[PDB]
Amino acid sequence: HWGYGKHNGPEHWHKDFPIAKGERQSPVDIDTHTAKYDPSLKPLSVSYDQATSLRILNNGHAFNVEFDDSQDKAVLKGGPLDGTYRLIQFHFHWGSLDGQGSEHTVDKKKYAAELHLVHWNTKYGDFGKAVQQPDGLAVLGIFLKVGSAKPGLQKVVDVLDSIKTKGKSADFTNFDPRGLLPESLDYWTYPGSLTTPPLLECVTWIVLKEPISVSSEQVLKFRKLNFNGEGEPEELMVDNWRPAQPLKNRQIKASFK
Ligand SMILES: O=C(O)Cc1cccc([N+](=O)[O-])c1
Numbered sequence: 001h002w003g004y005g006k007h008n009g010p011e012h013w014h015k016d017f018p019i020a021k022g023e024r025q026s027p028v029d030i031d032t033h034t035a036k037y038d039p040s041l042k043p044l045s046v047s048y049d050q051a052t053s054l055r056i057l058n059n060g061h062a063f064n065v066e067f068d069d070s071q072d073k074a075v076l077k078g079g080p081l082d083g084t085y086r087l088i089q090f091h092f093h094w095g096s097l098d099g100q101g102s103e104h105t106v107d108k109k110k111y112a113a114e115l116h117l118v119h120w121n122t123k124y125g126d127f128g129k130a131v132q133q134p135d136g137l138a139v140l141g142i143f144l145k146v147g148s149a150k151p152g153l154q155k156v157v158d159v160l161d162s163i164k165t166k167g168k169s170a171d172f173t174n175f176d177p178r179g180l181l182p183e184s185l186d187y188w189t190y191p192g193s194l195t196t197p198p199l200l201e202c203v204t205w206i207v208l209k210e211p212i213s214v215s216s217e218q219v220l221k222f223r224k225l226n227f228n229g230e231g232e233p234e235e236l237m238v239d240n241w242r243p244a245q246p247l248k249n250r251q252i253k254a255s256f257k
């Protein structure tokens with residue numbers, strides 16, 4: 001019964017999941033000066049026109065916006081990827097304060113939040129099988145800074161009062177995740193892991209260089225969510241980020257000079 005506290009947070013997870021101390025754990029600090037520009041990288045293709053959002057769920061650690069992943073409706077290809085990766089969900093990690101919240105850091109800078117668009121490799125047939133493979137997932141990561149509002153985020157923010165507590169869900173159809181992307185698709189990439197238990201080393205990370213801007217008011221609404229279930233003491237869902245882990249024997253590659 002893991003979480004983000006003193007007693008059950010990141011620094012404890014290794015007792016249940018020894019892979020927490022593995023060779024390709026995420027997130028990491030992105031040292032921009034040492035990431036190498038890679039010309040082998042094929043261009044990134046985000047094809048979200050046919051996306052079908054279905055539901056938003058408070059899973060006790062975050063909220064997930066879930067998609068129909070039963071066809072190639074919203075897919076990621078190119079970049080560092082071989083093959084086609086299907087969108088299953090997106091989520092965020094965020095802080096108690098604007099000065100922290102992201103999982104990846106950029107030259108040690110922490111952003112207020114980080115958006116993760118999670119995709120699985122269609123060669124493995126479903127998500128559950130894909131997470132068992134070293135190239136099973138592709139996560140597109142987007143930093144959030146506090147400034148102007150992000151108009152395409154407001155639909156997500158407004159429904160959060162309906163899923164305040166763990167295990168609550170609500171219908172969430174017709175949401176277009178294209179409205180959460182920055183202008184540029186320049187990126188860094190490296191091999192890593194999921195960042196909660198079970199910490200599986202199945203992710204090709206693709207972290208965009210350009211953050212999106214969200215308003216103070218939008219991020220404040222994330223911080224009104226609860227880790228707890230209804231009828232349990234209130235514990236605000238904040239600081240649901242794992243800190244940076246050792247890079248070990250990995251290289252971060254840049255798609256841009
Ligand atoms: O890496 C995370 O944010 C934790 C996590 C946990 C379980 C599933 C996830 N997913 O990518 O579907 C992500």
Ligand code: NI
Pocket residue numbers: 001002
């Ligand atoms: Ni547990």
Ligand code: NI
Pocket residue numbers: 091092093116195
């Ligand atoms: Ni994540």
